[PDB]
Amino acid sequence: GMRALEQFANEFKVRRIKLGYTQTNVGEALAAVHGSEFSQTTICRFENLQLSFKNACKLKAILSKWLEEAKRRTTISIAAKDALERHFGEHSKPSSQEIMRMAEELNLEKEVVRVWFCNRRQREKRVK
Amino acid sequence: GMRALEQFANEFKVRRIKLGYTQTNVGEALAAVHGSEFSQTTICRFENLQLSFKNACKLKAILSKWLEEAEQKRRTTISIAAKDALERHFGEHSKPSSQEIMRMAEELNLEKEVVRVWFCNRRQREKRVK
DNA sequence: TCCTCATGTATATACATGAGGAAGG
DNA sequence: CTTCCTCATGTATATACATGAGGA
Q: Using the beta-carbon criterion (under 8 Å), do B129 and A53 form an inter-chain contact?
């Protein structure tokens, strides 16, 4: 069923990260239950649920076996991101206090917002 | 000038493929003669010129010399226009006959196999939960 | 001949990091 | 001493092209 699949893919990611694992580490560690390793891509597809229902469920089993047996990237939402980009056009170099205010309203950490802004600037300076 | 910059990145990608290297291999071969190994990401940024103008000139000096001493899968890049036609056709008829596929290939100058797989993958994504 | 399917390898994208400079006044 | 930049290039994760095995 979809609801237990969605709920699981959500929590698997939560657990995977808290536990220090990289999509590649996990795909490579599955040989302890599966007899073979899965690729980085595969684990991404499962977490993002970019597979067939049949496929995703099969994996949900393998991966669950592994789990009980067993910077950290911050994903910025498609609401925060295109709303940071809306703050950039206004001013592309907010000062110390404003980046803190933005982190506050977006409940993110001062440092991911800071680095996003620095990165957005590098983008402007690129050739193509 | 930049005109020469733009044309080289382009001809670097074509000569890479026709020789047998992948972006990953360029970074490795570029270690045997240059010392340090560049990631795949860097090689990709270069070809796509997703670098600062200065950076792009530095890399070009390195890559320029290597490519000519390099005279001793095979992914296909599908253009933005090719992709535009492809999905227009998809929406008209999702599963083309072998004649049709062969025609779109001749029309876009791609191998019949590339059009074939492009259709299959496109159908396969719509069978996904998300 | 060609599709479906699971899952891979080649690329492109989003988030990081380290060294080295600016200036508080 | 601190605190936020620029800049070349990094790693972790997302995407696009390809494979091979069986339907049948």
A: yes
